[PDB]
Amino acid sequence: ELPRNLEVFNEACGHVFGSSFNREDNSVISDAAAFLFKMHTHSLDGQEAKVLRASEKKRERENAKKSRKAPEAGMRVGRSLILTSRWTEYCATCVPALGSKMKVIKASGDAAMIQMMKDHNSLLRVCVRIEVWKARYVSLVALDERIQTLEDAQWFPYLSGDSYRACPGLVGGYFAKKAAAGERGKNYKKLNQTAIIPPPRFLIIGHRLQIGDQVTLRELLASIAWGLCDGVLAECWSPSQGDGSIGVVVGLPLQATGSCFLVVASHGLSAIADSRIENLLEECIAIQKQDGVIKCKRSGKSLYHCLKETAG
Amino acid sequence: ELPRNLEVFNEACGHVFGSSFNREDNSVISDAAAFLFKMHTHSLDGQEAKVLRASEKKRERENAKKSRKAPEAGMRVGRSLILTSRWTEYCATCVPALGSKMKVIKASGDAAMIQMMKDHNSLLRVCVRIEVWKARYVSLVALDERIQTLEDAQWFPYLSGDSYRACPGLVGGYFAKKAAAGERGKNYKKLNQTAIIPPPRFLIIGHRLQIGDQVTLRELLASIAWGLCDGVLAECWSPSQGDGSIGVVVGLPLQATGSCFLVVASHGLSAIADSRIEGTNLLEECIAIQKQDGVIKCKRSGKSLYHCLKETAG
Amino acid sequence: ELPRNLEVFNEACGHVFGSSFNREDNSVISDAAAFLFKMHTHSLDGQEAKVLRASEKKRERENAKKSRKAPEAGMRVGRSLILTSRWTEYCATCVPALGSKMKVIKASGDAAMIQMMKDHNSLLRVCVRIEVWKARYVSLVALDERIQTLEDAQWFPYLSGDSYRACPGLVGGYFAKKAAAGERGKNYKKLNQTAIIPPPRFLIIGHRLQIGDQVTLRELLASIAWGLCDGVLAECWSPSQGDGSIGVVVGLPLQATCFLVVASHGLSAIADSRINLLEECIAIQKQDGVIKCKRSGKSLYHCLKETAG
Amino acid sequence: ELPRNLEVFNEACGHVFGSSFNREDNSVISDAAAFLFKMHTHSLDGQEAKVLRASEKKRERENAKKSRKAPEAGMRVGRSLILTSRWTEYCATCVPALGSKMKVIKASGDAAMIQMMKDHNSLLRVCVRIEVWKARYVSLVALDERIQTLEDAQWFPYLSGDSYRACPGLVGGYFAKKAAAGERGKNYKKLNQTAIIPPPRFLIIGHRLQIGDQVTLRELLASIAWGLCDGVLAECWSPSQGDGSIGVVVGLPLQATSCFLVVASHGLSAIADSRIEGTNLLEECIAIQKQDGVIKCKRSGKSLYHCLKETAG
Amino acid sequence: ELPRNLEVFNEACGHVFGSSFNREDNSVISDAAAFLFKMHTHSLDGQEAKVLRASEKKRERENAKKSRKAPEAGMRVGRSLILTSRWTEYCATCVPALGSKMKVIKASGDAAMIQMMKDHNSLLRVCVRIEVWKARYVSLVALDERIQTLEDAQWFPYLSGDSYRACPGLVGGYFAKKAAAGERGKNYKKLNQTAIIPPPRFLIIGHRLQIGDQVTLRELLASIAWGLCDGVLAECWSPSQGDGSIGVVVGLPLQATGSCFLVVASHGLSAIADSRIEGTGNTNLLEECIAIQKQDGVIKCKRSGKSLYHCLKETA
Amino acid sequence: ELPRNLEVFNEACGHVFGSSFNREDNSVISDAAAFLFKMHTHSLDGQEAKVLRASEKKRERENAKKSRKAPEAGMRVGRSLILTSRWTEYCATCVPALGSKMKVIKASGDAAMIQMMKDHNSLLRVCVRIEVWKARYVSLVALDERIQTLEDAQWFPYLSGDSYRACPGLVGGYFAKKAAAGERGKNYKKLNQTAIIPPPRFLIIGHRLQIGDQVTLRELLASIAWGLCDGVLAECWSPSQGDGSIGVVVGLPLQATGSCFLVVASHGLSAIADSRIEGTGNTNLLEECIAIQKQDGVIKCKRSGKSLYHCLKETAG
RNA sequence: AAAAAAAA
RNA sequence: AAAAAAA
RNA sequence: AAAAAA
RNA sequence: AAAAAAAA
RNA sequence: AAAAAAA
RNA sequence: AAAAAA
Cβ atoms of A126 and A9 within 8 Å: the answer is: yes
Sign of the alpha-carbon dihedral angle for D213, D217, D222, D228: positive
Q: Which residues have a Cβ under 8 Å from the Cβ of B14 and sit 6 or more positions away?
A: B21
Residues in chain E: 316
Q: What does the DSSP assignment read for B1-38?
A: ---HHHHHHHHHHHHHHGGG--SS-HHHHHHHHHHHHH
CB atoms within 10 A of CB B107: 9
Whole-number Å distance between alpha carbons of B143 and B141: 6
Q: What is the DSSP letter of A287?
A: E
Helices E217-224 and E111-138, interaxial angle, to 10°?
Answer: 120
Buried b / exposed e across A237-254, counting CB within 10 Å, b at 16+? beeeeeeeeebebbbbbb
Distance between C281 CA and the closest CA of chain D, angstroms: 12
Q: What angle do CA F275, F281, F285 make, to 5 degrees?
A: 65
CA E229 vs CA C140, D266, E118: distances in Å: 68, 22, 35
Interatomic separation, CA of residue D121 and C1' of nucleotide I1, rounded (Å): 15
Judged by phi (left if over 0) then psi (alpha if -120 to 50, else beta), residue A42 lies in: left
**For chain C, which chains pass the contact test of at least 3 CB pairs under 8 Å?**
B, D
CB atoms within 10 A of CB D215: 23
Mark out the alpha helices in chain A (DSSP H runs).
Answer: 4-17, 26-40, 56-67, 86-94, 102-108, 111-139, 150-153, 161-166, 174-180, 200-203, 217-224, 303-310
Whole-number Å distance between alpha carbons of C170 and C131: 10
Enclosing H/E stretch for D138: helix D111-141
Whole-number Å distance between alpha carbons of E172 and E195: 12
Q: Does B173 touch chain A (CB under 8 A)?
A: no
Helices B4-17 and B111-139, interaxial angle, to 10°?
Answer: 80
Residues of D within 8 A of C260 (CB-CB) are 147, 150, 153, 228, 303
Cβ atoms of B233 and B224 within 8 Å: the answer is: yes
Q: Does F174 touch chain E (CB under 8 A)?
A: no
HSE of D62, CA atoms in CB hemisphere, 13 A:
15
Lateral strand order in the sheet of C290-294: C251-253, C281-286, C290-294
CB atoms within 10 A of CB A51: 12
The verdict on a CB contact (< 8 Å) between C257 and D281 is no
Which of C184, C254, C258 would best serve as a mutation to test chain D binding (most D beta carbons within 10 A)? C258
Whole-number Å distance between alpha carbons of F68 and B130: 95
| Technique used by the depositors | cryo-EM
Tell me the one-letter amino acid at C157. Answer: P
Judged by phi (left if over 0) then psi (alpha if -120 to 50, else beta), residue B58 lies in: alpha
Interatomic separation, CA of residue A102 and C1' of nucleotide J6, rounded (Å): 10
- Report the SS3 class of residue A284: strand
Interatomic separation, CA of residue F139 and C1' of nucleotide G8, rounded (Å): 25
Interatomic separation, CA of residue B137 and C1' of nucleotide L3, rounded (Å): 64
Cβ atoms of E31 and E77 within 8 Å: the answer is: yes
Q: Is the peptide bond before B199 cis (omega within 30 degrees of 0)?
A: no
Residues in chain F: 317
CA D187 vs CA D208, F42, F138: distances in Å: 26, 21, 16
For D253, phi then psi, to 5°, come to -65, 150
As to burial, measured by CB atoms within 10 angstroms (0-12 exposed, 13-18 middle, 19+ buried), residue F287 is exposed
Distance between C228 CA and the closest CA of chain B, angstroms: 5
Q: Is the peptide bond before D157 cis (omega within 30 degrees of 0)?
A: yes
Mark out the alpha helices in B140-208 (DSSP H runs).
Answer: 150-153, 161-166, 174-180, 200-203
Residues of D within 8 A of C258 (CB-CB) are 143, 147-148, 228, 303, 305
Tell me the pairing of strands D294-298 and D285-290.
Answer: antiparallel
For B303, phi then psi, to 5°, come to -115, 135
Residues of C within 8 A of D228 (CB-CB) are 258, 260-262
Residues in chain A: 312
Q: Which of residues 226-255 of B touch strand L (CB under 7 A)?
A: none
CB atoms within 10 A of CB B242: 7
Determine if strand L comes within 7 Å of the CB of C146: no
Which of A267, A274, A285, A291 would best serve as a mutation to test chain B binding (most B beta carbons within 10 A)? A267
Chains B and C: how many Cβ contacts under 8 Å? 79
Which contacts of D201-206 are long-range, i.e. CB under 8 A and separated by 24 or more positions?
Answer: D201/D23, D201/D24, D201/D25, D201/D26, D201/D29, D203/D6, D203/D126, D203/D129, D203/D130, D203/D133, D204/D6, D204/D9, D204/D10, D204/D23, D204/D29, D204/D126, D205/D2, D205/D6, D206/D2, D206/D3, D206/D6
Q: Is the peptide bond before E157 cis (omega within 30 degrees of 0)?
A: yes
Which contacts of D237-240 are long-range, i.e. CB under 8 A and separated by 24 or more positions?
Answer: D240/D214
Whole-number Å distance between alpha carbons of A40 and A17: 15
Report the first-to-last Cα separation within chain E, whole angstroms. 41
Whole-number Å distance between alpha carbons of E178 and C109: 67
Q: Which residues have a Cβ under 8 Å from the Cβ of E112 and sit 6 or more positions away?
A: none
Judged by phi (left if over 0) then psi (alpha if -120 to 50, else beta), residue D128 lies in: alpha
Cβ atoms of D32 and D76 within 8 Å: the answer is: no
The verdict on a CB contact (< 8 Å) between F269 and E290 is yes
Q: What is the DSSP letter of C119?
A: H
Sign of the alpha-carbon dihedral angle for A278, A283, A284, A285: positive
D298 has which bridge partners? D285
Q: Does D59 touch chain C (CB under 8 A)?
A: no
F229 has which bridge partners? D263
Whole-number Å distance between alpha carbons of A97 and C77: 72
Q: What is the DSSP letter of B82?
A: B
Cβ atoms of B199 and B129 within 8 Å: the answer is: no
As to burial, measured by CB atoms within 10 angstroms (0-12 exposed, 13-18 middle, 19+ buried), residue B85 is exposed
Enclosing H/E stretch for C133: helix C111-141
Whole-number Å distance between alpha carbons of B196 and D135: 63
Buried b / exposed e across E147-180, counting CB within 10 Å, b at 16+? beebeebbbbbbbbebbbebbbebbbbbbbbebe
Whole-number Å distance between alpha carbons of B256 and A269: 11
Distance between A145 CA and the closest CA of chain E, angstroms: 6
The verdict on a CB contact (< 8 Å) between D263 and F154 is yes
**For chain A, which chains pass the contact test of at least 3 CB pairs under 8 Å?**
B, E
- Report the SS3 class of residue A272: strand
Closest to D267 (Cβ–Cβ): which among F193, F259, F310? F259
Chain I: nucleotides under 7 Å from a protein CB?
A: 3-6
Q: Which of C297, C296, C212, C298 is nearest to C251 (CA)?
A: C212
- Report the SS3 class of residue B109: coil
The verdict on a CB contact (< 8 Å) between B150 and A189 is no
In F94-123, the residues whose Cβ lies within 8 Å of chain E are: none
Q: Which of B6, B3, B4 is nearest to B203 (CA)?
A: B6
Strand spans (E) along chain C: 76-77, 81-82, 237-240, 243-249, 251-253, 281-286, 290-294
The verdict on a CB contact (< 8 Å) between E267 and A274 is no
Q: Which nucleotide is nearest to A43 (CA to C1')?
A: J7
Cβ atoms of C261 and C250 within 8 Å: the answer is: no
Sign of the alpha-carbon dihedral angle for B49, B50, B54, B57: negative
Chain breaks of chain A after residues with C–N above 2.5 Å: 278
Structural domain boundaries of chain C?
A: 4-143, 214-307
Q: What is the DSSP letter of A233?
A: G
Distance between E106 CA and the closest CA of chain F, angstroms: 37
Q: What does the DSSP assignment read for chain F?
A: ---HHHHHHHHHHHHHHTT---SS-HHHHHHHHHHHHHHHTT-STTS----SS--HHHHHHHHHHHHSPPPPTT-EETTTEE--TTHHHHHHHHSPPTT--HHHHHHHT-HHHHHHHHHHHHHHHHHHHHHHHHHHHHHTTS--SS--SHHHHTT-SB--HHHHHH-TTT-BSHHHHHHHHS---TT-----TT-----HHHHTTT----TT-EE-HHHHHHHH--TTBBGGGGGGEEEETTEEEEEEE-EEES--S-----B---TTPPPBS-HHHHSSS---GGG-EEEEEESS-EEEEE---SBHHHHHHHHT-
Chain J: nucleotides under 7 Å from a protein CB?
A: 1, 3-8
Q: What angle do CA B85, B88, B92 make, to 5 degrees?
A: 155
Whole-number Å distance between alpha carbons of B95 and B81: 20
Q: Is the peptide bond before A157 cis (omega within 30 degrees of 0)?
A: yes
Tell me the one-letter amino acid at F172. Answer: G
Interatomic separation, CA of residue D75 and C1' of nucleotide L3, rounded (Å): 27
Whole-number Å distance between alpha carbons of F301 and D218: 52
As to burial, measured by CB atoms within 10 angstroms (0-12 exposed, 13-18 middle, 19+ buried), residue D265 is buried
**For chain B, which chains pass the contact test of at least 3 CB pairs under 8 Å?**
A, C
Q: Does A260 touch chain B (CB under 8 A)?
A: yes
Q: What angle do CA B116, B119, B124 make, to 5 degrees?
A: 125
Q: What does the DSSP assignment read for F279-312?
A: SSS---GGG-EEEEEESS-EEEEE---SBHHHHH
CB atoms within 10 A of CB F271: 15
Sign of the alpha-carbon dihedral angle for D245, D249, D252, D257: positive
Whole-number Å distance between alpha carbons of A43 and A37: 9
Whole-number Å distance between alpha carbons of F260 and F275: 9
For B171, phi then psi, to 5°, come to -105, 140
Whole-number Å distance between alpha carbons of B133 and B200: 8
- Report the SS3 class of residue E6: helix
Specified resolution (Å): 3.5
Q: Do chains C and D touch (3 or more CB pairs under 8 A)?
A: yes
Chain breaks of chain E after residues with C–N above 2.5 Å: none
Whole-number Å distance between alpha carbons of E131 and E216: 18
For C238, phi then psi, to 5°, come to -150, 125
Whole-number Å distance between alpha carbons of F12 and F94: 9
Helices C111-141 and C4-17, interaxial angle, to 10°?
Answer: 80
Q: Does B262 touch chain C (CB under 8 A)?
A: yes
Q: Which residues have a Cβ under 8 Å from the Cβ of F197 and sit 6 or more positions away?
A: F129, F132, F133, F136, F170, F203, F223
Distance between D235 CA and the closest CA of chain C, angstroms: 14
Strand spans (E) along A139-259: 214-215, 237-239, 247-249, 252-253
Cβ atoms of E234 and A242 within 8 Å: the answer is: no
Determine if strand L comes within 7 Å of the CB of C54: yes
Question: What residue in B sits closest to C300 (Cα-Cα)?
Answer: B263
Cβ atoms of D172 and F129 within 8 Å: the answer is: no
